[PDB]
Amino acid sequence: AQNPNCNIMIFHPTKEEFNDFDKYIAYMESQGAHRAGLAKIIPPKEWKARETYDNISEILIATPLQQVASGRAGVFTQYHKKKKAMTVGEYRHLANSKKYQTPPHQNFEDLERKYWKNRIYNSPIYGADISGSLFDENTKQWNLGHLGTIQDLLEKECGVVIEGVNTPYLYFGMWKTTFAWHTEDMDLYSINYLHLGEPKTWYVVPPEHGQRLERLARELFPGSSRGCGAFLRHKVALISPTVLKENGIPFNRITQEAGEFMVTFPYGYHAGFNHGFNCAEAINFATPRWIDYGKMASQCSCGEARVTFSMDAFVRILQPERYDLWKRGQD
Ligand SMILES: O=C(O)CNC(=O)C(=O)O
Ligand SMILES: [Mg+2]
Ligand code: NI
Ligand SMILES: [Zn+2]
Asked: Does ligand 1 come within 6 angstroms of the Cβ of 142?
């Protein structure tokens, strides 16, 4: 079995290997990359996502989210308070202000220590989940707006044609902006490209051990667990590496820098934080190997998780028994 310790693997495809996206994902899996839940892909030196980032400041962040924490430094939830719209140029200036800027630090490890010590005492503002793309239309390789769609994959594998669309999302971050522990909708893959700016630190639990994380989360967030049998779908709970190590939960960590891709694999729980002002683009995707994970994915039916239009068909076809209850949670 390849990668039996479930380490995060880093890949350096050549420009020739960068042509066929599906083939390269299957290659990484042949080497055991999925066992970690997360892999890093460094693009060939010849590749670029676009020519420059000099003209992005007029993108609108219609609903910036202030991420307010509750709990203790290693075990907390966050809720998102909606703020007034602002442009990317306004948000960049805000991120670089004295109130929100990255503190002085020695290295990524020092900054990670400062994040876990101090995150709860601040409320950073995240420009998350903005439909759109920063890939140039002429970029033909690993262009996250030109991937094969999940609907087309389901149709190729299963023969059933379904409604729905699959487009990318932009994330504008600042110091301490946080992504809570989650797997993707329907336990899909994700791919994330860090277009510019400061790094993003990731934590990940191997898919084979995801239920260990879930059991810890039920213990640590007991009211949330009574409310919902899949409350991590709410995407609000944080657990630090120190707490994970104290409870014996297997995980790994890695820092993504600008110009790098990350892939999360089906049922790979992940969480993390941004180091300073940055912009990332991410999208969900599927492969043949996903189908079995989609059929087994948990679902939130309490009403909290509320998701896209396109998840309807995935539930309806892959999980017909759950469909009626889940749809009630959507309505
Ligand atoms: O970058 C973020 O805030 C969160 N991204 C992801 O969870 C992802 O790409 O799957
Ligand atoms: Mg602009
Ligand atoms: Ni994710
Ligand atoms: Zn729920």
From this structure: no
